[PDB]
C-alpha cells in the first residue's frame, strides 16, 4: 500500500555483490525517505530526470542492493570494465535508472575485518547485463580438472573484502542501490506523490 | 570487449573532400555520444565535434563547422566524419572516441561525462597533390 | 574558448622518481577536467577524469588534483612503461580543448 524504500535502504546488512539482492510495486515512490540516509553522490541518473520521478508512473521498480568498495564505485555504470563490472554486476548499456552509493565504513566494517562481504575474482566470461552469478567452482590457471582442489594453478572464484574501519576510501565499504524504472506495455504500479 | 575500427589511410587533393569510418562493436550502438579528434604529425590533440548516435544530431566546432559533417548509420553501427574543402593544415591522424553516458544529478540538472574511454586506432589523411 | 597552458614541455626523470605536470585553465572549469596518455603511434589513453578521478585499470601510482583552474597529475614512482605524452581537457564549456601536451622522458 506504499513503497517500502527503507526496507532497501534501512536494512541491517547488504548482500555481496557476486550475490546481489533484487527487490520489485503498487504504490507511492515518496523518495525523500530515502533521504533519512543523507545524500550522497553520484546519482548519475541515467535516462531519467529525478526531479520529474514524483510526477512519472512505471510499471515496475527493481532496486539491487549491494556492496562494494571505494574505487569500484565508478564502475556500477553502463559501459563500464573492471573486476565488479565484468565479473559480478553488469548493468546494461540502454539502462534508464539510477545509481545511489554512499559509504559505510561505520555500518560495513568491524576492527578484525568483515570478510562477510565478498567478490568474484575470476570468471572465463564478462557477465551480461544483469546477469547473477553464484558460481563456486574452481577456475584453474589453465584448462585442468582441479577437482575441487583449491591450490596450484587452481583459484578459489570468490575474495573476501576484509573491511576495516582503518582502510582507506578507496578501500572502504560503499553500500549501493541500482534502481532500474520498468516501463512495461501494462498498467503503472508505481507513481510519484504527485502521479 | 569494446572495439572501434577506422577505415584506412587516405590522400586527397587540396580542395577535395574525405569520409572517414568508425565501425563500432560489442556495446549497444545507440546509446553512447561519438566524438572526433585530431591530430596534425607531431602536434596535439584537436577537439572536432560530437555527434549523438541514436538521433543523429551533431555539434561541431567552430573552427570547422561549414567544412565537416558527421553522421551515423546504426543497421552497421558505423559512423562516419567526412570533411570538405581539404587543406595541407588537415593532414592528420583522425580519432573516433567514445565516452560514457551524460546523466543528472539530484537537483534535476543534466551532467556531462565527456571523458574519453574508448579510441579508435585513427586515420591518416594526407592532403597532397 | 578555454584555453589550458600545459606544464613543462617535456621532461627527463629516472625510475621511480615522483613527477609532477601542471595545467591551467584560462577561466573556471571547476573539476571538468581529463589527463589523457598518449603512446608514440598510438591513441590518447584516458587515465584520469574529473580531476581526480582514476580509470579502471588505472595504476595507484596516478593522480590527479585541483578545482578551478589549476589542476595537477602526479606520477608517484614513474615506471618504465609511462613513457608518452600527456594531455589535459576539460569539458566544462565546448568546444572541448586540450592541452599542448607534454612529454615524458626517462633517464637510465
Known amino acids: 500500500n506504499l513503497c517500502p524504500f527503507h526496507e532497501v535502504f534501512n536494512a541491517t546488512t547488504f548482500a555481496s555483490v557476486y550475490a546481489w539482492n533484487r527487490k520489485r510495486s503498487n504504490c507511492v515512490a515518496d523518495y525523500s525517505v530515502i533521504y533519512n540516509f543523507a545524500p550522497f553522490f553520484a546519482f548519475k541518473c541515467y535516462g531519467v530526470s529525478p526531479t520529474k520521478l514524483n510526477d512519472l508512473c512505471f510499471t515496475n521498480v527493481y532496486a539491487d542492493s549491494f556492496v562494494i568498495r571505494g574505487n569500484e564505485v565508478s564502475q556500477i555504470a553502463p559501459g563500464q570494465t573492471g573486476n565488479i563490472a565484468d565479473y559480478n554486476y553488469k548493468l546494461p548499456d540502454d539502462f534508464t535508472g539510477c545509481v545511489i552509493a554512499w559509504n559505510s565504513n561505520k555500518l560495513d566494517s568491524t576492527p578484525s575485518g568483515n570478510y562477510n562481504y565478498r567478490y568474484r575474482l575470476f570468471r572465463k566470461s564478462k557477465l551480461k547485463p544483469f546477469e547473477r552469478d553464484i558460481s563456486t567452482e574452481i577456475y584453474q590457471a589453465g584448462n585442468k580438472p582441479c577437482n575441487g582442489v583449491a591450490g596450484p594453478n587452481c583459484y578459489s572464484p570468490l575474495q573476501s573484502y576484509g573491511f576495516r574501519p582503518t582502510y582507506g576510501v578507496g578501500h572502504q565499504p560503499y553500500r549501493v542501490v541500482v534502481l532500474s524504472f520498468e516501463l512495461l506495455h501494462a498498467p503503472a504500479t508505481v507513481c510519484g506523490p504527485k502521479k | 570487449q569494446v572495439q572501434l575500427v577506422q577505415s584506412g589511410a587516405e590522400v586527397k587533393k587540396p580542395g577535395a573532400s574525405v569520409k572517414v569510418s568508425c565501425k563500432a562493436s560489442?556495446?549497444?550502438?545507440?546509446?553512447?555520444?561519438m566524438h572526433w579528434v585530431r591530430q596534425a604529425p607531431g602536434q596535439g590533440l584537436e577537439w572536432m565535434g560530437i555527434?549523438?548516435?541514436?538521433?543523429?544530431?551533431?555539434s561541431y566546432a567552430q573552427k570547422f563547422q561549414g567544412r565537416v559533417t558527421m553522421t551515423r548509420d546504426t543497421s552497421t553501427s558505423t559512423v562516419y566524419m567526412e570533411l570538405s574543402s581539404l587543406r595541407s593544415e588537415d593532414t592528420a591522424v583522425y580519432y573516433c572516441?567514445?565516452?560514457?553516458?551524460?546523466?543528472?544529478?539530484?537537483?534535476?540538472?543534466?551532467?556531462?561525462?565527456?571523458?574519453?574511454?574508448?579510441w579508435g586506432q585513427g586515420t591518416l589523411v594526407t592532403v597532397s597533390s | 574558448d578555454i584555453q589550458l597552458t600545459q606544464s613543462p614541455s617535456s621532461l627527463s626523470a629516472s625510475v621511480g622518481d615522483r613527477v609532477t605536470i601542471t595545467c591551467q585553465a584560462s577561466?573556471?572549469?571547476?573539476?571538468?577536467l581529463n589527463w589523457y596518455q598518449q603512446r608514440p603511434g598510438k591513441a590518447p589513453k584516458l587515465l584520469i577524469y574529473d580531476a581526480s578521478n582514476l580509470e579502471t585499470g588505472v595504476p595507484s601510482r596516478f593522480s590527479g588534483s585541483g578545482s578551478g583552474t589549476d589542476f595537477t597529475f602526479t606520477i608517484s614512482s614513474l615506471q618504465p612503461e609511462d613513457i608518452a605524452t600527456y594531455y589535459c581537457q576539460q569539458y566544462d564549456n565546448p568546444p572541448l580543448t586540450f592541452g599542448g601536451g607534454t612529454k615524458l622522458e626517462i633517464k637510465r
Open positions: 572516441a567514445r565516452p560514457p553516458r551524460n546523466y543528472y544529478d539530484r537537483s534535476g540538472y543534466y551532467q556531462r561525462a565527456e571523458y574519453f574511454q574508448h
Open positions: 577561466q573556471d572549469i571547476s573539476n571538468y
Open positions: 560489442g556495446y549497444t550502438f545507440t546509446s553512447y555520444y
Open positions: 555527434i549523438n548516435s541514436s538521433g543523429g544530431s551533431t
